Structure formats: structure tokens, C-alpha cells
Design a protein around this ligand. Structure first.
Ligand code: DYT
Ligand code: MG
Length: 321
């Protein structure tokens, strides 16, 4: 029920300041952009729905790999502590915890994410399902507070969903290098990476028939409207998903149907969009198996295991110091 440890390194005023800075920088850039972290206001609900769309294969593909190989993953890791870069709300989390329990290894769960309220809820759910488990939640941002994750036990750190694909190569390398420097001998990283495949399937996964992804994308405008007193007309922006073959990444864009004039009153800022002008809201890099090995090695980690679905749509790596 209520048994919990929670460390909170984020402040409400500090997040508000981060949004101010990001929106000012992004809307005044020669090529306009907004960071996708701001998708996930209570947007989080829309993303949950996205994971169940027929076109969006990543979640169910990763889940099926875990469903059939979690015992092997847990045996390879030999960890008694599961660290999740994420909130611990998924079935995937339970697949891993179940296997750790079956192996009589499980002692501790450490969820790491940016919303304290969700960490509390997940902690209560996990606590009830795995009596005796120690839960140490950390509210922090995984590009700054990784050093705050406790080093107790032998740790399996998981970063699922190909969320690592939201980082472009330079910040991605810095992230993996930093994460690797918080690991001890005996610790393991379990990394989910979505893989290069048919480009039609890729684009459709980010431009579903039902329009749910379009709603998710346009909602970042609603976040700016509410939080920074802006007047984006959401109906005036078209959802566009692109495959960038040079960078091998999916991109989400918002395209102005007609010229728009947007005042972001909280920033004392007026922003103009030309008819047809596009603003970048997300990248989702896709990986080649051989390159995953290389990126891990450059970060100081040796890939010891690789799991992929029979179609080769998605990959999971286990890597060690
Ligand atoms: O890049 C993804 O696939 C996840 Cl992390 C976020 C997302 C899902 N649909 C649009 N963006
Ligand atoms: Mg003013």
C-alpha cells in the first residue's frame, strides 16, 4: 500500500523555467522546433492509446520479446534490483519483475521518472503485487540526475520503448556514456531499440488512420497555450510524419495550413508562421543491429545478448561494463 521511499530532485518552478527557455529558443529558431518532452502532460493519456494502435508496432513487438525471453534476460543479468528509466506502469515492467521473482532474485525496484505522482501510484501497485519488495523511487530527469539512482544491489537498468531514439546522435552518445559511468561491475543495461524496416510501415506507425498520433502532436500546442498564455489555433496545423533517409529517423512536424500569428504572452513574444511553414516536434531514430553494438561499445558497454522478434522489427540488447 503506502510503503515507499521517494527522492525528488525536480521542482515545479524549475520545470516552468525549462518550458519558458525551450519554447523561446524553439519558436525563434530559423527552423522552428519544440522538444518532445513537453508532449507528456496529463498527452501521456494519448501516448498510452498510441501503444495500442494497429499501426504502432513497437510496444507490442517489444512486449512479445520480453514475454518469450524474460527468463533468459533475468538469468543473464543475475540482478536482484530492477532500475527502470520509466514509471513502472507497464506490463513489460511486470514481465521482468515476475521473472526476477520466479528466479528468487528480486529484492528491489527503482523507478526513475519526472512525475512524482505517477511514481507514487506505480509504487503502490508494485508493492501490492510483490510483497516484501523494497521500492526506492527517484523523481529526476535522466539527463542530469542519473548519479542520484542508488547503487545498492546488483542492478539491471532498463530503458525500453526505443525512447533512446528521441535523442539525436550527440546527446545520445553523451547519455549512454554517462549512464555507463553510473554502473558498477556486475550491473547490466537492457536497452530497447526500434530497427530500420519498410519505410511505409515506419511512416504509418507515426501517422495512424484514426488520427490519434496527430492529436498527440498537436497537443504540444495546447500545452504552450495553457502554460505560457499563447493562442495557437490547433485546427490550423497539419500533422506530418516524415522518414528522413539520411539520418534514418522518423520525424514529426506541424505544418501551418495558412499564415498564423501567435502571441506567447507569458514570454512577451509574437511568433509568425508562413503558410506551409513546418515546425519539428519530434525525432525517432531507427537503428541497425550492427550499429547498436558500436554505440554501446563507444559508451564503454559490451553487448552480451541481443534479442529480436522473428521479423527483425525491434531489438533488445543486454550490455555490461
Ligand atoms: O518515438 C516513439 O515511437 C515514442 Cl518514444 C514516442 C512517439 C510515439 N508516437 C509518436 N511519438
Ligand atoms: Mg507583454
Amino acid at each position: 500500500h503506502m510503503a515507499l521511499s521517494l527522492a525528488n530532485y525536480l521542482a515545479a518552478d524549475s520545470a516552468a523555467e525549462a518550458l519558458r527557455r525551450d519554447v523561446r529558443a524553439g519558436l525563434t529558431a530559423t527552423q522552428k522546433s519544440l522538444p518532445p518532452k513537453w508532449f507528456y502532460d496529463a498527452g501521456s493519456d494519448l501516448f498510452d492509446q498510441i501503444t495500442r494502435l494497429p499501426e504502432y508496432y513497437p510496444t507490442r513487438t517489444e512486449a512479445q520479446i520480453l514475454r518469450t525471453r524474460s527468463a533468459e534476460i533475468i538469468s543473464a543479468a543475475g540482478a536482484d534490483t530492477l532500475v527502470e528509466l520509466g514509471s513502472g506502469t507497464s506490463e513489460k515492467t511486470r514481465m521482468l519483475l515476475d521473472a526476477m521473482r520466479d528466479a528468487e532474485l528480486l529484492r528491489r525496484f527503482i523507478p526513475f521518472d519526472v512525475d512524482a505522482g505517477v511514481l507514487r501510484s506505480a509504487g503502490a501497485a508494485i508493492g501490492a503485487e510483490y510483497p516484501g519488495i523494497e521500492i526506492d523511487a527517484v523523481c529526476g530527469d535522466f539527463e542530469e540526475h542519473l548519479g542520484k539512482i542508488p547503487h545498492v544491489g546488483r542492478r539491471l537498468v532498463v530503458f525500453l520503448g526505443s525512447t533512446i531514439g528521441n535523442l539525436t546522435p550527440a546527446p545520445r552518445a553523451e547519455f549512454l556514456s554517462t549512464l555507463a559511468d553510473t554502473l558498477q561491475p556486475g550491473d547490466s543495461l537492457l536497452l530497447g531499440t526500434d530497427l530500420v524496416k519498410d519505410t511505409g510501415r515506419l511512416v504509418r506507425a507515426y501517422d495512424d488512420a484514426a488520427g490519434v498520433t496527430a492529436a498527440f502532436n498537436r497537443n504540444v500546442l495546447a500545452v504552450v497555450n495553457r502554460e505560457l498564455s499563447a493562442d495557437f489555433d490547433l485546427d490550423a496545423f497539419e500533422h506530418v510524419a516524415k522518414w528522413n533517409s539520411d539520418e534514418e529517423r522518423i520525424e514529426m512536424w506541424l505544418r501551418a495550413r495558412t499564415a498564423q500569428h501567435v502571441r506567447v504572452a507569458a514570454l512577451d513574444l509574437e511568433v509568425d508562421f508562413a503558410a506551409g511553414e513546418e515546425m519539428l516536434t519530434e525525432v525517432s531514430c531507427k537503428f541497425r543491429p550492427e550499429n547498436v553494438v558500436a554505440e554501446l561499445a563507444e559508451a564503454g558497454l559490451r553487448q552480451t545478448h541481443w534479442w529480436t522478434d522473428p521479423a527483425g522489427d525491434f531489438g533488445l540488447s543486454l550490455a555490461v561494463r
